[PDB]
Design a binder for this molecule. Structure first.
Ligand code: 6X4
Length: 418
């Protein structure tokens, strides 16, 4: 009897696969709960919001939905909502360099898009009784990340989303901006079907209450909010510079790992630079640490017993990069093979293989970096990642990682001639 089925959205704010496996706010909260129940967690992902509620309410479907949901009516007993675990405020979003709307009326005449079946579509439905001139579009083939992208690039003028979605994604869409809060703050909650037995619901709320206080929720809220992921290019002045101040402390370790693994030490050093700017005490709330930013797991798998030791960190991250490169399909030849190895280092081999399958179906060459790097940002677009085996990944940040490591590599190559 020991298997909790939880239905969710495949999206960065809820549940997704990265290079280490499953992750996401909802995914963890649901995992720390199935642990507290002594059962196996089975994640199931819905096609869109209507379908989530449909699967929740058909027999015999999933136990609960954990998916950043805004509770509906309390006197509707068909669906029942847990206590709230996170507070958000819906926000109108516009693009920088356009007329910032200041109040609900200003939405008339703009192109507006929201997820179909959402809290946020209902808010506009309501607003449209008060202003029949309002027009807006609804879609099941987008996620909140698509909407922000569409605003960012100017394919639509405005959207409406929860503020936590904005905290999560803002950094990856430089052109987007809050126009105004549009509704009162409210708390998200898990959704269970109604309703005759309260066994589960009572356990859910005991958990969500214990997780606040005990800090668990604020723990999570901070790991994921505002977080950067892949560092920006620092420019020639700063690299300058760290070449002078930092590299000489570590060059010998890069050179020795280079010999040991029969590979260009300058590319190892470039990775290290993108990962930590050559700082052996660097860390993230995401659980990587050291000069090459290894996870505990990857560190153990590579013989690394102290992640804060530069020589060990450099030895293990390099081993990891080189093994990833060796495991790629034989049809990928150098120099592309190294660029694919960097892409997998960041996004994981599974997402990378989906991008290669996608490229093929597009009539492109799946052994060429210039082709597959065109596919990678589509893994952030629902229309595309829903047709893939591993779903969403922030593929545009993978591309940025590879480009940045190649820029540092090219400079290092230049100052190390002839
Ligand atoms: C906590 C977690 N996300 C986070 O980033 C963490 C860091 O805070 C989360 O649960 N997020 C969801 C994200 C996406 C979302 O906006 N989902 C919708 C659908 C999007 C509609 C926008 N056009 C919703 O709010 N509510 C559903 C529709 C509902 N009321 O049933 C949420 O805030 O909701």
């Amino acid at each position: 009897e020991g298997v909790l089925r939880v239905i969710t959205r495949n999206s960065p704010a809820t549940y997704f696969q990265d290079r280490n496996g499953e992750t996401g706010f909802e995914y963890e909260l649901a995992k720390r709960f199935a642990e507290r129940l002594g059962v196996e967690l089975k994640i199931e992902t819905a096609d869109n919001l209507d379908d989530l509620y449909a699967q929740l309410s058909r027999e015999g479907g999933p136990a609960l939905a954990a998916a950043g949901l805004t509770p509906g009516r309390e006197d509707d007993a068909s669906v029942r909502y847990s206590h709230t675990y996170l507070d958000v405020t819906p926000q109108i979003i516009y693009r920088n360099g356009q007329q910032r709307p200041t109040r609900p009326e200003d939405l008339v005449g703009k192109r507006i898009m929201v997820l179909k079946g959402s809290s946020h579509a209902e808010q506009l439905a309501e607003l449209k009784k008060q202003y029949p001139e309002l027009k807006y579009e609804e879609s099941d083939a987008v996620e909140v990340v698509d909407l922000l992208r569409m605003v960012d690039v100017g394919d639509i003028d405005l959207t409406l989303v929860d503020s936590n979605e904005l905290a999560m994604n803002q950094v990856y869409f430089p052109n987007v901006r809050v126009a105004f809060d549009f509704g009162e703050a409210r708390g998200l909650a898990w959704a269970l079907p109604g309703g005759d037995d309260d066994s589960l619901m009572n356990e859910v709320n005991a958990f969500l209450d214990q997780a606040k206080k005990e800090g668990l929720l604020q723990r999570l809220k901070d790991r994921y909010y505002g977080h950067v992921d892949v560092l920006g290019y620092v420019g020639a002045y700063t690299f300058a510079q760290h070449l002078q101040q930092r590299l000489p402390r570590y060059e010998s370790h890069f050179k020795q790992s280079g010999k040991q693994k029969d590979t260009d030490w300058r590319l190892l050093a470039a990775i290290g630079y993108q990962e930590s700017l050559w700082q052996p005490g660097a860390t993230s709330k995401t659980g990587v640490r050291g000069l090459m930013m290894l996870t505990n797991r990857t560190a153990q798998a590579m013989g690394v017993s102290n992640r804060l030791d530069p020589k060990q960190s450099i030895q293990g991250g390099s081993k990891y990069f080189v093994q990833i490169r060796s495991e790629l399909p034989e049809s990928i030849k150098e120099p592309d093979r190294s660029w694919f190895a960097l892409a997998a280092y960041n996004i994981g081999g599974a997402h990378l293989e989906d991008a290669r399958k996608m490229a093929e179906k597009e009539g492109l060459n799946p052994n060429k970096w210039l082709d597959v790097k065109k596919m990678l940002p589509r893994l952030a677009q629902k229309q595309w990642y829903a047709k893939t085996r591993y779903g969403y990944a922030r593929g545009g940040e993978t591309v940025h990682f590879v480009q940045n490591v190649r820029r540092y590599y090219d400079i290092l190559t230049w100052v190390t001639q002839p």
